[PDB]
Design a protein around this ligand. Structure first.
Ligand SMILES: *C(=O)CCCC[C@@H]1SC[C@@H]2NC(=O)N[C@@H]21
Lengths: 507, 91
């Protein structure tokens, strides 16, 4: 056998992976293989695979046998482009040793992370594993340590996107916790530290795989996964479109893309969304959809902390992040869960120079022992900090209510905001007229007259505007045009801040 | 219009350029009835719709040439979005 023949056989084996019968199982299971997934993700013909001939060096427990020598060692790594833009990817291959992590496995992933940091290119990981490769022992633990170090170092330098498309257990579960966004695939992906076998052995509780770490749990109740997609093909199609929003590095401005939607059009549909009756809820999403370019909005965690809306959109071609209250759910009140989702989203957009638009309608905080015992004070400070720290353009629109300390938490002008607009129905106060009059006028005669006088003077947007809290009071139909104008002039804004070794968010 | 065919053709055009979104509307029914061969000829009785749609309204039925035009439009529009996605400011 010649050298060239050996090489050709090594290429064909790396392409097959764990063997055709294991591929057949993956397809029976409704899953794509690691190499098929890359072909869908990246532009045709743009993918360049690295280190395809790397094999493990473990010789213990029979691992020195030729029957265990799978070139590629369970990961596909390399670089490519999505719509002409450079991206680094890796995808874990479940057909070779179960997708378990070896020393060399982690290495290959680390090397492309080092290039991505060096050139300033994003990294997308497609995760699917069973955990560490116990046959090597502590080399897989060193593998995890090296990946974790890169994931932390890359934070704020390049965006890191993780899509989980299968099981995930052991140390693998912490890389999505270090990246910026985590997505899952409904009823196909799992994310858990230990399996149901350990849970039942430790505590006398019964649980199945879908209940312990299923995609529905992590997108609806734990707040870990940002969005689950129906299947592998739809998940990668939406991932490509999501990719188009983000810059390649934090040194880059928010991407600007060709846009046909005139920036100066009016939106008459906004003038009557907000009811005059204070106890009538409305859907904030109707406002978000009508303002954003071509009515396209990418919603993050649609099923978790529904009282606050966060997501991506484009206005006049430029990527922006949108945060707003949802009065339809829990009167639009802040709670622990909403503060966690908000702070994380805001922090990402600030780090990568993506402007923020805030739609405020918040009557206060959710009362009760469930929130007080949960540390609502500690968690609420997370959203206040996330806005106060921001140095990217911030445009706030107040649609109806902003009572109490929630006014400042939801990116008020006094946290170094750029512009703040009020709609005619906006009301800014420490509390509603009923509470304020009962406290201010206590024991006096003709309280009912005092109630009428207070409402006429303070139950509107004027006592705040005349003080400099609001820059203008605008007709809702003009909101989009007003925001577009601010975005196109604040984009070159820089501010100074004292030197710090690093930030100290309340956590 | 000046004649029966001009008024009907102009009506067909107005219905396709008439944007209603947010509710369910009945434009599909209006657009098909006015182009029905019995309506253009005039063989209309007060029970016209009950004999044309004996099993309910189903929607406009496409012929061979119309399906090819719809597929060509849908495919070209799909690509038009894919090409717009590639036009970035110069970095
Ligand atoms: C009735 O008296 C209950 C009042 C609750 C109104 C809302 S709920 C959360 C905010 N906190 C508060 O004191 N008022 C607001």
């Amino acid at each position: 056998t010649s050298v060239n023949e050996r090489i050709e056989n090594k290429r064909r084996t790396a392409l097959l992976g764990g063997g055709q019968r294991r591929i057949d199982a993956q397809h029976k299971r409704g899953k794509l293989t690691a190499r098929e997934r890359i072909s869908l993700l990246l532009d045709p013909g743009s993918f360049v695979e690295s280190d395809m001939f790397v094999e493990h060096r473990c010789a213990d427990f029979g691992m020195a046998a030729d029957k265990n020598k799978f070139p590629g060692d369970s990961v596909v790594t390399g670089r490519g482009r999505i719509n002409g833009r450079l991206v680094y990817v890796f995808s874990q291959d479940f057909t070779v040793f179960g997708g378990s992590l070896s020393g060399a496995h982690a290495q290959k992933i680390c090397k492309i992370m080092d290039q991505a940091i060096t050139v300033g290119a994003p990294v997308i990981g497609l995760n699917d594993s069973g955990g560490a490769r116990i046959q090597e022992g502590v080399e897989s633990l060193a593998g995890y340590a090296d990946i974790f170090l890169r994931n932390v170092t890359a934070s704020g330098v390049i965006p890191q996107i993780s899509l989980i498309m299968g099981p995930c257990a052991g140390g693998a579960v912490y890389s999505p916790a270090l990246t910026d966004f985590t997505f899952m695939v409904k009823d196909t992906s799992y994310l858990f530290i230990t399996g149901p076998d350990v849970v039942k052995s430790v505590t006398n509780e019964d649980v199945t795989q879908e209940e312990l770490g299923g995609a529905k749990t992590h997108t609806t109740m734990s707040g870990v996964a940002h969005r689950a997609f129906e299947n592998d093909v739809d998940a990668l199609c939406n991932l490509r479109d999501f990719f188009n929003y983000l810059p390649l590095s934090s040194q880059d401005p928010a991407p600007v893309r060709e846009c046909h939607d005139p920036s100066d059009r009016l939106v008459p549909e906004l003038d009557t969304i907000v009811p005059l009756e204070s106890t009538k809820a409305y859907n904030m999403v109707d406002i978000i959809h009508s303002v954003v370019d071509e009515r396209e909005f990418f919603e993050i965690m649609p099923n978790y902390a529904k009282n606050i809306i966060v997501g991506f959109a484009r206005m006049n071609g430029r990527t922006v992040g949108i945060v707003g209250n949802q009065p339809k759910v829990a009167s639009g009140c802040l709670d622990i869960n909403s503060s966690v989702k908000g702070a994380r989203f805001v922090r990402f957009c600030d780090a990568f120079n993506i402007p923020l638009i805030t739609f405020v309608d918040v009557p206060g905080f959710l009362p009760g022992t469930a929130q007080e015992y949960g540390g609502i004070i500690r968690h609420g400070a997370k959203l206040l900090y996330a806005f106060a720290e921001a140095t990217v353009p911030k445009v706030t629109v107040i649609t109806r209510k902003a009572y109490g300390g929630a006014y400042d938490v939801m990116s008020s002008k006094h946290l170094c905001g750029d512009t703040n607009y009020a709609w005619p129905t906006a009301e800014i106060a420490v509390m509603g007229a009923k509470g304020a009059v009962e406290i201010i006028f206590k024991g006096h005669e003709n309280v009912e007259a005092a109630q009428a006088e207070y409402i006429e003077k303070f139950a509107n947007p004027f006592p705040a505007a005349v003080r400099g809290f609001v820059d203008d009071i605008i007709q809702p139909s003009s909101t989009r045009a007003r925001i577009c104008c601010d975005l196109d002039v604040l984009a070159s804004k820089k501010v100074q801040r004292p030197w710090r070794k690093h930030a100290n968010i309340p956590l | 219009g000046s004649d029966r065919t001009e008024a009907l053709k102009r009506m067909a055009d107005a219905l396709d350029n008439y944007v209603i979104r947010g509710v369910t509307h009945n434009i599909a029914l209006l657009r098909e009835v006015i182009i029905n061969s019995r309506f253009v000829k005039g063989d209309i009785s007060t029970k016209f719709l009950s004999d044309v749609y004996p099993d309910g309204f189903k929607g406009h039925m496409l012929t061979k040439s119309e399906k090819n035009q719809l597929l060509a439009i849908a495919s070209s529009l799909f690509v038009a979005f894919q090409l717009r996605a590639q036009h970035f400011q110069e970095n």
